[PDB]
Amino acid sequence: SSTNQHIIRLESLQAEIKMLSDRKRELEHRLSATLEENDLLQGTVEEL
Amino acid sequence: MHVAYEEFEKVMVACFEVFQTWDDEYEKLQVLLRDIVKRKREENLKMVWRINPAHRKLQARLDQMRKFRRQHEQLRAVIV
């Protein structure tokens, strides 16, 4: 019972970690895309 | 639907024993898989399993089917 409650609490911990880490990858994906865009925008500003 | 109430008790008990056996053996299995992943820790960076067993839908549905019958048959005998 201790191990089951404890490993279910840990499954909660790790599942929360996986959601948040999927969201890390999503935020990092968006940050990479936006920063690449901002490089493109700086290029557009320079050309203009 | 057509069998007697008591025969249904017996069949329901057998089905519940099957579900409980699945749960117990899967818990032992999860112990084993936790240990094998942990020993080969570098191999698996993410250890989640999130096992949605298919019969959980059947199990919850049958369980609702039980409580319905037991409450209902009790009501029918009492109200008479």
Could you write out the three-class secondary structure of B22-49?
HHHHHHHHHHHHHHHHHHCCCCCCCCCC
Interchain contact B40–A (C-beta under 8 A): no
Query: Under a CB-based contact definition with an 8 Å cutoff, are residues A3 and B28 in contact?
Result: no
Report d(CA A14, CA B46) in Å as an integer.
9
Helix (H) or strand (E) holding B76: helix B55-79
CA B7 to chain A, closest CA, distance in angstroms equals: 33
Instruction: Give residue ranges of A with CB < 8 Å to any B CB.
Output: 4, 7, 11, 14-15, 18
Are the beta carbons of A18 and B27 separated by less than 8 Å? no
Give the CA count within 13 Å in the CB-facing half-sphere of B57: 3
Alpha helical stretches, state H, chain A: 2-47
Cβ-based contacts under 8 A for chains A and B: 10
The dihedral through the CA atoms of B53, A15, A19, B60 has a sign that is: positive
Cα angle A24-A26-A29, degrees, rounded to a multiple of 5: 105
Experimental method: cryo-EM
CB atoms within 10 A of CB B8: 17
Tokens 């570098």 found at: B42
Closest listed residue to residue A15, CA positions, set B6, B52, B59: B52
CA-nearest residue of chain A to B51?
Answer: A11
Find which of A18, A24, A25 to mutate to test the B interface (most B CBs within 10 Å of its CB).
A18
Q: How far apart are the first and last CA of chain B?
A: 21
Q: Measured between beta carbons, which residues in chain A are less than 8 angstroms from residue B46?
A: 18
The dihedral through the CA atoms of B61, A4, B51, A18 has a sign that is: positive
- Resolution, in Å, please? 4.4
